[model samples]
Target: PMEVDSILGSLSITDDFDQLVDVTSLFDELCSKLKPEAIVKDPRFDLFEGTHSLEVNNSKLDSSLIELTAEEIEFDVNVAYDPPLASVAAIADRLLRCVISWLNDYQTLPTTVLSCRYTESLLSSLVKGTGSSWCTGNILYDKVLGSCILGVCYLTKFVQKLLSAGIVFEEEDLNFNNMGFNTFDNLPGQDVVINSLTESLQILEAYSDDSLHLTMLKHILKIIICLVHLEDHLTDYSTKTSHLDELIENANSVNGIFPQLQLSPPKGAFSTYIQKHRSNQFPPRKITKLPTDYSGFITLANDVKTILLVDKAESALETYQFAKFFNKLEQRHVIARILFPLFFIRDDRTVLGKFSYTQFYLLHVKEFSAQTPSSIGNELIQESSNMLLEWYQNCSQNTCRYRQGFNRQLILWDSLQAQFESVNSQVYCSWTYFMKLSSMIEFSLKGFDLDIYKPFEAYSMFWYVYYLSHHLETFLKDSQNDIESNINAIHSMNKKLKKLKAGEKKDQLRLKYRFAMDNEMEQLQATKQFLNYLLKEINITKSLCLIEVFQFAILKSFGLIDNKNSTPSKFSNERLIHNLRFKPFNSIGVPELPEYEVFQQTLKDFVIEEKGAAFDIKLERATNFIETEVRNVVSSIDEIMQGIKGGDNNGVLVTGTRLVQELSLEYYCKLKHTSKALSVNSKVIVNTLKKNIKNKDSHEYKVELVHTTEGWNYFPIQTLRIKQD
Candidate 1:
């Protein structure tokens, strides 16, 4: 038809229907006369295509329709509006559980929570009355149960607002399949939901008999109310966590009552009708179901309670540590996880509104900066500032997202550090220590968490980790001692003032050092103390890594593992795997990845390669060396853990950055177990290898990746498995 518009100058249609059909038929014949590709370039073909339809690919096409009772329909109000007190209560119970299904289990709305017939019935239809409930009341079913659904829907709306902030992807874990409904189109906000819920609670107590069910119903309403006010809670986070605490209390009541009481929704009350009738394109699937637990609500409240305390951190490191600990605990609810960055990166883009974006960078860097480092041009500052922002923003991401975010930053940081060094060398060291090392640390450690490394790969990986941590320790120690000089200046000035007689020179020198003696000493000491803590952190990390390095070496010495993949195929080879392992770091010009051979040879340095007495001495040396390293690591981990638990007057806890205080400590404790497991196995492996000392060429053992031994993730404990001599 469009082809004729270009060629025959638009075919004309007649007034009659029969004539119009004849015209279109003639146009089709003319179009077929042209080649198919000739009409492909027509602008009308691309511009006016049939594109305005819901497109989806799913196995299930439509939801089965259900018959609604006369009372269930909203066209009239006087039918079975007064449902059973237990019936409405059951409806309320099912509504709360749907939230768990949708949030905790990651289901869609229309199928899970919003699947209730009465909720969809009375809700899309609202109640706004100036005079009385004579026109708008349904007693238990319409007024009370709808109030319960209202509260639940309102809380979901609040999370919808959070998703609008663009921090969380809509489909990340929580999918926004609203199914053609605007959650807050004409819906009541927090206050009205609170009022309605309160009214519902009172009606349950007044109209119902069982005080036990009344209490259960009342507390569930309270949980909904707490979640309803979530926006308000985050707006002013300093508001007492009393509501969240009470929320936990209420969830406990609901938790007990929920399972013991086998209450269920009315048979026809929930269906897939909504998802089918609405504008959703996805075919219906089984709705996510949850019961026998109310722990989802408790965890939601508990996670929110912990996020609010991030306001308590007084320093930048404190806030940084807060985010670090947030990720350490467990996989938090998607709603709670998203709330952190939106709460942290506030309205003004300042971090928690405490430090300016640039000042926040100083919080992490100042511990290593001896003097106020020379300021660079604003261009470099903004580049570094954005890098810091990306770094903090990643703290709340899911595991894969967190790992990928780190993987992409190698070039951005290396360029910024190179630019910084061009201006002044001394000023840039503080920036480079964190900028380069933090990326490399995550670069090396993340592969272990994601299971990307093989048994042979950890040798090079941990060696690279060891190299970076050693450099970090070096920079931290130099800065720690450098800051000590500032303290020495304090004592030096005080001594001079004590000895010198009162005169012009004495007063002048006194005036000069007075500010240092009085004002700057606390910060200097704080920086010193923080550097001291970091030194211990990296020092212990390097030693533990070397122990794993030794274990991998022992397995290598047994002829089971190599520093390279033993089974690289023609389709995929060792160079490709190595490049992939160090893919992001290959371009890091500042701290370039060791080439394949260099990594190969460097890891070889840790192995024992000899025979008879010499081999025995070397094996014993590695065994003893691993044993000594384990003892030191256990003591060091304990020291840090104690400070994390006890008072941080030693500044170890604060320097460790309140990981213990904000939440229970787990990262280091895992390292503790990792250390202990290696201690027993390292010695046992040495003994096994020596027993067959006579048959050096015999195949005895294979390298078995032992992730099951206590500390599972991060570090894969490579253990020696006997194959037969």
Candidate 2:
């Protein structure tokens, strides 16, 4: 076997050649106006993407190539542990607080942005930040600062998304930018980050913290409301519709939305205004009453309503589905619970299956029995009995064997016992066993048993009984085997050492492997506990998926949700709001149209109530359910996400799960593992794997089962490699 490198690729950071625009001078001027005291310093406020390292190759000019060219900067990107928090709940709370600061500040509730930050803490699905921002950078528009406001506006939407689903974001990274790369378009307000913030704000408003998450929501809603015409225009462009052409020309005479606030000309000019007005004033647009009931506006309104209803239903469904999943201890729960235990159990099954099949084909023939000086049938029966006896003896002798090692033997011994006992005349293993045996004999000798007219049938029946006994015994003894395996693996390793040797050499041997085994045993026990939990959980999961259970569970989660039913306890107290009001939106009058304040509060409360009130508890339950339940035993879903063959080789052959392009495996092998074809450098191999894994599966698998009509998907491949090799 080949060893993988400790680091997959070299940390070569090179800046891409960007037309830097030398905006540093522009930024310096912009920063002064934004803050009079903010001097034009050398990145007093640094923008972080990935971690970066600058190398002055000339030792004077302060310039070096990074990775490649075209990109402005390069990231050496040391992802050494910059832990956020301990649990996801903490992370959520930290993020929520961050959004709250922005929300509170927008309403003038607080005069400044929240100064606290968060660390990148993770706990199962839940993550927390340690009072510091992650993957953070600032964009300073020394001249045109409107988009920066827009950026802040954009981020509020992300905050809202987090509040609703409590997403951890880009795995452990909490970098919306990183997360956005995989899921959505990269356009400023269109990506997952923007969508997340947008959705978060929407959900928060739709669900509970409307005011807090709604500042940006109203602006976006207003814009999308405007996009109705734009979308119509795009459609008209597609269809070459003359009527829409007239409408656009006609609408040209009409002033557009939020008439009081100048939004520049439209989408195209929005960016230009920033570039142009950097050192000047914002271009203003004439305002007019929005055609609230226009067909285009109606479509947008309907979409918003549709989105609201869908989200409402989705939230309800999600809660219900998850609650049931959690309560039922679904596959995710089982797999997480069973990983280590199943590792050993699965290993045993693999070993046992191979051994049984091998032994049957290699050693169980009547011819072999005939060599024992008896009829082939009698010889088989006699040998089977002997093997059973030998297995029992091994079990008795090795009861205190290496915990995992001994249990493996016990499973083998039991299986053998069942097979032998069923093969006796009194049991059913005789039929199939005999049938296979006879077939093999006939194939070898080219003759049939004259006296036994239906040898094949008889043998099949016997094998069926053999199968029954084996299955019954194994199933019955499963839990027992589990207990035995677990206990023996942990406590019985000493017996393993004892069996190894009898003197100082033995003790020394024990000191090496046994000591190491002891450390490994706890992890092993955690594994076993999880596995046994999984076995029990399998029943629960099956029930969860059943029509009665699943449908009912879904209903419970979303069924009761309705506007009237969601009213809060504090809503009746008007005086309380007057006394302790916190504004998240800039609005101060008319009870905040659309009732977003109530909406926000309601969503926050609902999320809290449905799970729990405490941040830790709610987060824990959500984490436990999502990470454990949602992702447990996902088999090769990760491969699909990465668009590559999965690590679990056994699953490589599963239908719908095979490699689309045949070349993937070969490419993967060449890249991930050292190729014997060439004595290449480790760095070269590492880089090759990184490239190949990301390459689309252009070639089909030799085995048609793994064929993909489309080429392999393009994606960033996750791999661990060592640089020190």
Candidate 3:
């Protein structure tokens, strides 16, 4: 009897004093009695038991709706629906906020703009002449407001069509809800939306006013129509800028007058009434607050225009640079991210209508005439197409997904490397280069960004990346030297052509061969210069990665950090964790991962054995070594930064990135910032060591892992502070 405890609660006989909101008998009395019987009878039904306990605590499950004033819900039946221009203007302005709220704030479609009864009723009308029968209120609400809502619906219809292409995700990046209206399934023609917007613009012109209400309505109408032609702009490369140019110009007109254009929308204009009418199981949500202005639309328009500039890419290398640099600075607008993949890979699968998907997958394949016979079939070529396209599509995904996208494709790239029969071809050579680079990039370069590399294992991870980059640096240097050899061969061919006399067939053969060889030389020279600039850049990258490895190695040698997991449980140990750490690169045949102790012992050589004067000499040598390397790396960084400064676009070191010059500049400037931080922090470690060597006991320092944008994400600077404990 002493072990007895309260199992079932005393029934709420005390709740007989309940009101309309709180009164519940059958629902509350059996809240415990009805369920959890299954849990006691069977162990398999445990998931069902938590629901009975949790449901009692969900107080908001039964709640009041958004309280509307009496006038707000009352429809005027006896009065003529003629209203002042200010009321019409206010309704139009509030509807604009609703549309922006749905798209920009990423609010749900039913919760934001679609909650407006006018939008809900008119949108349902495509199939609505197929449901509700409602009379038009007046000219201002019917003709003007009617056209505005239809144009917005028209914009929604085309964007929804892109969801079928399988580029973007639903509910997360965007929410498409036609609300049983069947808008996306059988969309109306663009001309219908276009002419309707025009008719509304004409209707606004008829109303002469001093308040600019009608003027604001017409400007926004033109913009809706401008965005309606998104398909036309994306399809024709020439017309890409045409639509945005006009949109930005008209938006400026709206923006200039936006401050003076505020007003309260008419009663019953926008409300939660649509949620009450719709058939969904969820509780209702309020509409998003209005944004500051219309400039968000313009910024989105400008981003789309920049994505379309990839059409100007003359080579695969230029296009690749564009895809890489465009998203490096910041995550792009959702529509811009959606359009990048669509525009890059068109209907025919030709890249921007220039290179065939086959040629694109094997970019430099043509330069070395490596051919696979027709009888063998194009299994490898077609498979390469999937991997390459997947790579490009992932580049434009949202920031978090962008890294995850690379993680998913790492296996695909490694798998594709196994299918190649011709190991010497550029198809294998080129893609394997990227496969390993991507494998290692996912390894720890981006690892720094996510703050996953703690100081304990930071040394091993940095060492592995440096190891990968060193091989890549050698690979590029080989490519650069070979390109130079080809240029020299072209020059040798030209010299032999000039020495022959103009007499017979032999001399005439030389003259004809010169016509072809001379032209090839021009292309070869350009290729050599591009390779040179690229080699220099990767060389800088490899050196910086080595510096990070050294920085972490120095930390481990000082006995402040370890090479193994500090926290281990029964299920996990150092070996299991280390194996899981490098699992992505485990299958790579050439770039084999060494033993964990191999990385463990790499830090041992730096540890000082001698105490007194010998330890002092050793630390000073290491300090001087770090200081010298920092100075050399910082100077190399300046040369590249100055190269970009001197040669704007398509000049000096900017030869390969013609289409993405500004973006490339932004990326280089970011690297410059990383280099500067490395300079400062490299000396921070040096001084910390320098001070510690001065005393017999010295000072014990603890490592602080700092994750910040001020320094490189890949190698988070270790803040070493003297610890009294």
Among all candidates shown, the one with the greatest TM-score: 1
The digit string of per-residue lDDT tens for model 2 on 1-725 reads 13245233232222354444668988777776886554444665554622353334533222221122211122111111122111221222222233323332221111111111111111101222111122223111110122222333334333334333321112121222211112132224434323433443344355333332123223333332232222222112122233333333323322232232222111121111211122211122112122221234232233222111211211211221222222121112111111111211122322112233223323323211111112344554554544432322221111112112223333333344356565553222432233222222222111111121122122222222233333323442463365446557546556667677588877786776666465555444433333333233232222212211111121122222222223367446533442222222113121122243543353344343452246335434432342343233232233332433332223222111131223333333322221111112222333443354356762211100011112111101111233332
| Residue lDDT tens for model 3, 1-725 | 22224322334545666654555876567566766653334556666555533222233331135466665466432222445466656666666666667666777778666766667766766653321123555666666667777777777777777776778787777777655557434446788778877887787787666457767777778888887887785556453477788888877888888887666666666766665556544455666677767777787788888888888877666777788778767778777888888888888768888878777866644332222222123777777777777888988877677766866676666666655634544546564565547456654577667666666777667778777777777776777677667667656766776676666965766765676465565555555555556667666667777666666656665666667755566886788888888887776665677777777676677556556678668766766665676667667667665665565244345445667777766666666667667657767876677667667788877776665474445556666877786
RMSD of 1: 6.9
Q: Which ten residues in a row have the lowest lDDT in candidate 3?
A: 367-376
In model 3, where do residues sit more than 4 Å from their true spots? 1-84, 129-137, 177-180, 184-187, 235-238, 281-283, 367-377, 421-427, 492-516, 557-560, 563-571, 606-631, 634-655, 688-716, 720-725
Q: What is the lDDT of residue 407 in candidate 1?
A: 72
Model 1 pairs whose backbones collide: none
| TM per prediction | 0.86, 0.17, 0.82
Evaluate residue 160 in candidate 3 and report its C-alpha lDDT on the 0 to 100 scale: 76
**Candidate 1 residue lDDT tens string, 33-131:** 998667545565664554543334433544334344443433332234333556667777778888888888887777777787655654555433111
CA lDDT, every prediction?
0.71, 0.28, 0.67
| Stretches of candidate 1 exceeding 4 Å from the true structure | 1-83, 126-138, 183-185, 373-377, 651-656, 662-664, 687-704, 708-712, 720-725
Per model, state how many residue pairs clash.
0, 73, 1
Candidate order (TM-score): 1, 3, 2
